[PDB]
A = this chain, B = another copy of it.
Amino acid sequence: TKYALVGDVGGTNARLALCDIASGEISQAKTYSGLDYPSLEAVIRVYLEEHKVEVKDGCIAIACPITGDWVAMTNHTWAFSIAEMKKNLGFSHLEIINDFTAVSMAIPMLKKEHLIQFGGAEPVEGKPIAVYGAGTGLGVAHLVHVDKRWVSLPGEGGHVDFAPNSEEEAIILEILRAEIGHVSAERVLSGPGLVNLYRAIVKADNRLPENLKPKDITERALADSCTDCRRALSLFCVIMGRFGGNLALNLGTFGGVFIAGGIVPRFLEFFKASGFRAAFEDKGRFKEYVHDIPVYLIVHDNPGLLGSGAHLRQTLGHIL
């Protein structure tokens, strides 16, 4: 006894692993470069050649929208049919889920070492949660507990309208509106978003922005070498907090609000010093509704693999 395949595929890397069906324990994690292989199926075939456990069931998390049978990646060239791959492999069950789904399903098996708290009291148990993360884009998922079942609630919530909170942010909205049409939260809360803030900040003060990259905004802000970059990073943290407070109000998320890494781990200290938590509770007479809600950065390394395990196991009739 007795293993299923799990997988966390994102950008150009494909990390695969084994999930113990009885326990949900993940082992034998291996990461392949998606640039070396023509498909996900041809990484799984290598992975499964080199472990010699009979696997029948698999759940792979992939950082792209999962709708029908056809899966097309966002930042890599892979695209495949779920049913074909399932048939081509030995497989009885083949679940393909979005990465934020896998992450939200990891959450109830995370322990306190897997979490860094930012304000709030303790979670109320069995109560709804929100996960978001600013990375390549802005992902959001929710999780609710209904009669022993953990039910994930996927969505495209990083694409809701950007909600400015001052004259400055408002000038940034309109600057972005004039280039790009509708301005979503993701336009400002992601890697490419941190660059949008930078450019908009410089354009509002009537200078010309350099062609900077997200790493350069971070690094020049963490250095204090550029006051445009420190303001970009600084507003990002505020915007991020406000947005997380809206998730919390919206779904009554007293189980807690979680941040999946993305770009934040790379500026933890600045993030901890930032106005994030004040922004989270900056809700007028509803400051009290969210005042005690915990926010956690998740710092577990493979919540994706964990979550796929949980999802699969729950699919196969297990109780998590």
Which residues of A, 139-164, contact B by the 8 Å Cβ criterion? 140, 142, 144, 146-147, 149, 151, 153-157, 159-164
A157 x B286 contact (CB < 8 A) = no
Q: Are B151 and A144 in contact (CB under 8 A)?
A: yes
Which residues of A from 161 to 191 have beta carbons under 8 Å from B? 161-167, 170, 173-174, 177, 180-184
Contacts of A170 in B (CB 8 A): 164, 167, 170, 173-174
Pick the contact of A249 from B157, B183, B252, B284 — CB < 8 Å? B157
Say what secondary structure dominates the interface of chain A. mixed
Residues of B within 8 A of A163 (CB): 160-164
Contacts of A154 in B (CB 8 A): 252
Count contacts on A: residues with CB < 8 A to the other chain: 46
A310 CB → nearest B CB, Å: 17
Q: Give the chain B neighbours of A289 by CB distance below 8 A.
A: 156, 159
Q: Which residue of the partner chain, among B165, B173, B184, B285, contacts A284 with CB atoms under 8 Å? A: B184
The complex places the Cα of A270 from the Cα of B25 at a distance, in Å, of: 58
CA distance A247 to B181 in the complex (A): 20
A185: shortest Cβ distance to chain B, in Å? 9
Instruction: Let me know if A313 is at the binding interface, CB within 8 A.
Output: no
Contact: A160 with B246, CB < 8 Å?
yes
Residues of chain B within 8 A of A249, CB atoms compared = 155-157, 159-160
Extra A-B contacts (11), CB below 8 Å, given A180-B284, A250-B250, A251-B251 = A144-B153, A146-B149, A156-B289, A159-B289, A160-B245, A160-B246, A160-B249, A160-B250, A161-B246, A167-B170, A170-B170
The 10 listed contacts between A and B (C-beta, < 8 Å) are A144-B144, A146-B149, A155-B249, A163-B164, A165-B173, A165-B177, A165-B183, A166-B177, A181-B284, A247-B250
